[PDB]
Amino acid sequence: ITGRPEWIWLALGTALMGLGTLYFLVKGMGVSDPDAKKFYAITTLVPAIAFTMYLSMLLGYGLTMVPFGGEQNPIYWARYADWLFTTPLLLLDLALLVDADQGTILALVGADGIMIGTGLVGALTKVYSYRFVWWAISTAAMLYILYVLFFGFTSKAESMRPEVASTFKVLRNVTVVLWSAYPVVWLIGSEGAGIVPLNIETLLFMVLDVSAKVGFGLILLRSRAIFGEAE
Amino acid sequence: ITGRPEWIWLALGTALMGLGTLYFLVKGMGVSDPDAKKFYAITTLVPAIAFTMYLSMLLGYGLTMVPFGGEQNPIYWARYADWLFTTPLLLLDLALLVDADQGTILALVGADGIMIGTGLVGALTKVYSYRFVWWAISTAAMLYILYVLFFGFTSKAESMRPEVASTFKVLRNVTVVLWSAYPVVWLIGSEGAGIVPLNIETLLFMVLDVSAKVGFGLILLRSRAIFGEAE
Amino acid sequence: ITGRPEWIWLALGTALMGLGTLYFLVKGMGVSDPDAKKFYAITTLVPAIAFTMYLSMLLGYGLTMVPFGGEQNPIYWARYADWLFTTPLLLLDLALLVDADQGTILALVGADGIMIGTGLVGALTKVYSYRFVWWAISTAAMLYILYVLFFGFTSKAESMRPEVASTFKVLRNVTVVLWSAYPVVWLIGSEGAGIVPLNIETLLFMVLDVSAKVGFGLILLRSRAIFGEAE
Ligand SMILES: *C/C=C(C)/C=C/C=C(C)/C=C/C1=C(C)CCCC1(C)C
Ligand SMILES: *C/C=C(C)/C=C/C=C(C)/C=C/C1=C(C)CCCC1(C)C
Ligand SMILES: *C/C=C(C)/C=C/C=C(C)/C=C/C1=C(C)CCCC1(C)C
């Protein structure tokens, strides 16, 4: 473990996901409302999956060596196996909040799958210039997702209950700001231009992951918007 | 790129998927009806996924070498990663048209997954005779899908709105004719008996893919059947 | 085939899955009730997927060599590709029986995916001590699933129709007893401590798989609980 200088951030990430999982799991024990049970299930599944993948990176399983630039570069592929499942679930948390129609949910989940899959292909691509072509395609998918979150979801949330509108507005702003940082970190880090070394990149991804999963869930699961309107 | 003689068809396929994606994406911008939004989301996701996989084949990522017959044979595995996601979506486009029940949809999607997965296993199998065992299992799954499209779906479509019945009949005939050609091309091409060389096989798959995705979508998204009956 | 002593059990498993698939496929031909069609679709898909993966193990495709303990150990990875799709479907068969809410279904399917995925990671892990860490995480996911089947599902089934309550109670007891045996067999077999040799382990998994899929389906598809209450 300790032979890699990024291990501490991996270890910290593992701890912060596991604790977060346990907290959400304890917080949803006394919940009988089926809407709230949906939100608790999705929101608790997110850091549990992230916990397993951070642990696989810490133990060395989720790492491979990819030759590009004449070098063997360490690529943590397990992130993508994380994100493939946790980014649609997070989007589902937003979409159930505003009661989105099924076609918009399918468009969001499909564009997210394209984003993560093309990011994985770009991370594993051996021709150095082609990695940025895949980065550009994935960033276009992200920009579609952010467009849908701003111009199909806010004006839908304004016509619903005021608590779900305010909670959605906060979670939307958190999501857009945090998700936009990931392609920048990928571009300047070890998967892209190699300006930022791998230990600092691992720290940055850990802060982003913990914020976008545990902090997101802390804002969501403390709101009254997850419960059905009942007496 | 240009070192492989099939590259031109890969390039053409990439172009025709991307253009098709853009056209559907522009055509669904002015759509507010939620049924039509479902059909536009599914139908636009299909050539976008196909675009990414054609690009991966063009850049050389979606190709591997499989030893059989004493030879290293070029196998484009990315097709299967395409088809695993795009063939159920296309089937979903048919199933939402006739308002199929959930069990029939689950049977169709599961049989389709078996078809694509056993095709992938047969494409990667190193023992030459076993490749045709997997081909036979996949063809049996295809024949189940075609049976369901003819004897559980046509007599359901006849009791619905006449526009959805005529549009379903056209798309069903297009789907059956185009999908039946794929196991023949696999059997006589480089994955099977090797009678047709890889560049002609790549051309044939490109014509089939463009027809079964973009032409299918052009027939579907121009019909009144995708809209709810409203004044 | 015959060079491996476990081949006979693989062959027997393949036969028993295929026959079981055919029987369910013939038994659901005369079914028009949409609830019963859902149960027949799920229950027939389970041994069909298991058939394909048993065949891949018999032909040698679903086997890889994993170095641990200074040895190259034969690991049948195809089991996990089986279980990833067939264990949620079986859970779905239970969840549709008691009309479970969507959040509970999502929690069950997600915990099941974590169980199978961490089992696969543990099966492929080259550091011998870490294999049991992944075993422990997967067993914790299994214990969550069994908790939900006993303390969120039985008291829901008691308020429904009596035939669905009795059928659910039988299938729940069968499921809990059979599913609890799998981590024990993994732990003492060739993936874990290596006390039981691979041919006996393959026999044990074949008996468990045939019981938990075909016997489960025989109990389910003979019950009146799968039909809607109609005159
Ligand atoms: C739980 C972690 C989350 C919320 C991860 C979010 C990740 C992204 C929004 C990733 C985006 C990427 C691009 C847009 C292009 C470069 C490749 C990726 C995968 C880093
Ligand atoms: C978008 C492309 C589509 C519609 C692809 C359709 C592909 C099939 C129907 C493939 C079928 C196969 C068999 C039935 C057996 C041989 C292996 C396959 C995968 C080529
Ligand atoms: C169709 C076959 C079925 C029902 C398989 C069930 C498998 C399990 C419940 C597997 C569980 C495992 C653990 C709980 C820990 C050890 C690893 C596994 C994957 C064997």
**Two structure tokens written together for C114:** 């974590």
- Partners of residue B71 on adjacent β-strands: B68
Chain C residues inside the 8 Å CB shell of B125: 59, 61
Task: Quote the ligand 2 centre to B10 CA distance (angstroms).
Answer: 18
One-letter amino acid at C218 equals L
Chain B residues inside the 8 Å CB shell of A110: 41, 45, 48-49
Place of tokens 């501490």: A8
Select from A110, A108, A122 the least CA-distant residue to A186: A122
Contacts for A71-79 with beta carbons within 8 Å, 24 or more apart? A73/A190, A73/A191, A74/A4, A74/A190, A74/A198, A75/A123, A75/A124, A75/A190, A75/A191, A76/A202, A77/A120, A77/A123, A77/A124, A78/A53, A78/A54, A79/A53, A79/A205
Q: How far apart are CA A19 and CA C207, in angstroms?
A: 39
**Two structure tokens written together for A201:** 């990149």
Chain C residues inside the 8 Å CB shell of A42: 103, 106
Q: Concatenated DSSP letters for A132-158?
A: HHHHHHHHHHHHHHHHHHHHTSHHHHT
H or E element in which residue A175 lies: helix A162-188
Interface test with C, best of A1, A27, A38 (most C CBs within 10 A): A38
Task: Quote the ligand 3 centre to C184 CA distance (angstroms).
Answer: 9
One-letter amino acid at B231 equals E
Q: Residues B40, A103: contact at Cβ < 8 Å?
A: yes
Q: Residues B113, B141: contact at Cβ < 8 Å?
A: no
- Partners of residue A231 on adjacent β-strands: none
Select from C40, C187, C66 the least CA-distant residue to C127: C66
Q: Which of B101, B117, B121 sits opposite C34 (nearest CB)?
A: B101
CB contact under 8 A, B52 and A118: yes
CB contact under 8 A, C104 and A41: yes
Longest dimension (CA), chain A: 66
Place of tokens 């396929």: B13
Q: Residues C98, C160: contact at Cβ < 8 Å?
A: yes
CB contact under 8 A, C103 and A60: no
- CA contacts within 13 A on the Cβ side of B26: 5
Longest dimension (CA), chain C: 66
Interface test with C, best of B109, B115, B121 (most C CBs within 10 A): B121
C128 reaches A (C-beta below 8 A): no
- CA contacts within 13 A on the Cβ side of B29: 8
Q: How far apart are CA B66 and CA A199, in angstroms?
A: 37
Neighbours of B2 (CB within 10 A): 7
Interface test with A, best of B17, B33, B42, B59 (most A CBs within 10 A): B59
Q: Concatenated DSSP letters for A3-52?
A: TSTTHHHHHHHHHHHHHHHHHHHHHTTT---HHHHHHHHHHHHHHHHHHH
Q: Residues A212, A178: contact at Cβ < 8 Å?
A: yes
A175 reaches B (C-beta below 8 A): no
Q: How far apart are CA C158 and CA C179, in angstroms?
A: 23
Q: Is the CB of C139 under 6 A from ligand 3?
A: yes
Longest dimension (CA), chain B: 66
Q: CB pairs below 8 Å between A and B: how many?
A: 47
Task: Quote the ligand 3 centre to A25 CA distance (angstroms).
Answer: 23
**SS3 sequence, chain B?**
CCCCCCHHHHHHHHHHHHHHHHHHHHHCCCCCCHHHHHHHHHHHHHHHHHHHHHHHHHCCCCEEEEEECCEEEEEECHHHHHHHHHHHHHHHHHHHHCCCCHHHHHHHHHHHHHHHHHHHHHHHCCCHHHHHHHHHHHHHHHHHHHHHHHHCCHHHHCCCCHHHHHHHHHHHHHHHHHHHHHHHHHHHCCCCCCCCCHHHHHHHHHHHHHHHHHHHHHHHHCCHHHCCCCC
Q: How far is CA B169 from CA A69, B35, B143, B196, C177, in A?
A: 54, 19, 18, 33, 49
Q: How far apart are CA A20 and CA A39, in angstroms?
A: 15
Select from A82, A77, A62 the least CA-distant residue to A190: A77
Q: What is the DSSP letter of A76?
A: E
One-letter amino acid at A175 equals T
Select from A98, A90, A100 the least CA-distant residue to A164: A98
Provide Rg for chain B, Cα atoms.
18
Nearest CA to ligand 2 atom 16: B183
| Strand residues in A56-214 grouped as ranges (E) | 63-68, 71-76
Q: How far apart are CA C111 and CA C117, in angstroms?
A: 10
Q: Is the CB of B54 under 6 A from ligand 2?
A: no
Select from C141, C225, C135, C214 the least CA-distant residue to C178: C214
Q: CB pairs below 8 Å between B and C: how many?
A: 47
Q: How far apart are CA B109 and CA B87, in angstroms?
A: 8
Q: What is the DSSP letter of A227?
A: S
Instruction: Looking at the complex, report in whole angstroms how far the Cα of residue A41 sits from the nearest Cα belonging to chain C.
Output: 5
Nearest CA to ligand 3 atom 5: C83
- Partners of residue B72 on adjacent β-strands: B67
Q: Residues C210, C17: contact at Cβ < 8 Å?
A: yes
Strands A71-76 and A63-68: antiparallel
Q: How far apart are CA C26 and CA C222, in angstroms?
A: 13
Place of tokens 């779905």: C92
Mapped onto helix, strand or coil, the DSSP state of residue A89 is helix
Q: How far apart are CA A103 and CA A88, in angstroms?
A: 14
Mapped onto helix, strand or coil, the DSSP state of residue A170 is helix
**Two structure tokens written together for B74:** 């070029």
Nearest CA to ligand 1 atom 9: A179
Sorted by sequence, the CB contacts under 8 Å of residue A213 that are 6+ apart come out as A17, A20, A46, A47, A50, A86, A90
- List, in order of start, the domains of chain B with CATH numbers: 1-231 (1.20.1070.10)
A59 reaches C (C-beta below 8 A): yes
Mapped onto helix, strand or coil, the DSSP state of residue A211 is helix
10 Å CB burial of residue A220 (0-12, 13-18, 19+) is: buried
Q: How far apart are CA A109 and CA A124, in angstroms?
A: 23
Q: How far apart are CA B79 and CA B75, in angstroms?
A: 9
**Two structure tokens written together for C134:** 């992944």
Buried b (16+ CB within 10 A) or exposed e, A186-199: bbbbbbbeeebebb
Select from C57, C62, C55 the least CA-distant residue to C18: C55
Rounded to a whole number of angstroms, the distance between the first and last alpha carbons of chain B is: 53
H or E element in which residue A220 lies: helix A216-221
Q: Concatenated DSSP letters for C200-222?
A: HHHHHHHHHHHIIIIIHHHHHHT
For C76, list phi and psi in degrees, rounded to 5.
-85, 95
**Neighbouring chains of C at 3+ CB pairs within 8 Å?**
A, B
Q: How far apart are CA C41 and CA B113, in angstroms?
A: 14
Q: Residues C95, C108: contact at Cβ < 8 Å?
A: yes
Q: How far apart are CA A129 and CA A185, in angstroms?
A: 17
Place of tokens 């990522």: B61
Q: Concatenated DSSP letters for chain C?
A: -TTSTTHHHHHHHHHHHHHHHHHHHHHTTT---HHHHHHHHHHHHHHHHHHHHHHHHHTTTTEEEEEETTEEEEEETHHHHHHHHHHHHHHHHHHHHTT--HHHHHHHHHHHHHHHHHHHHHHH-SSHHHHHHHHHHHHHHHHHHHHHHHHTSHHHHTTS-HHHHHHHHHHHHHHHHHHHHHHHHHHHSTTTT--S-HHHHHHHHHHHHHIIIIIHHHHHHTSGGGS----
For A66, list phi and psi in degrees, rounded to 5.
-115, 125
Q: How far apart are CA C4 and CA A83, in angstroms?
A: 39
- CA contacts within 13 A on the Cβ side of B121: 27
Among left, alpha and beta (phi > 0; psi -120 to 50; other), residue B189 is beta
Q: How far apart are CA B52 and CA B13, in angstroms?
A: 11
Q: Residues B213, B20: contact at Cβ < 8 Å?
A: yes
Resolution in A: 1.8
- Partners of residue A67 on adjacent β-strands: A72
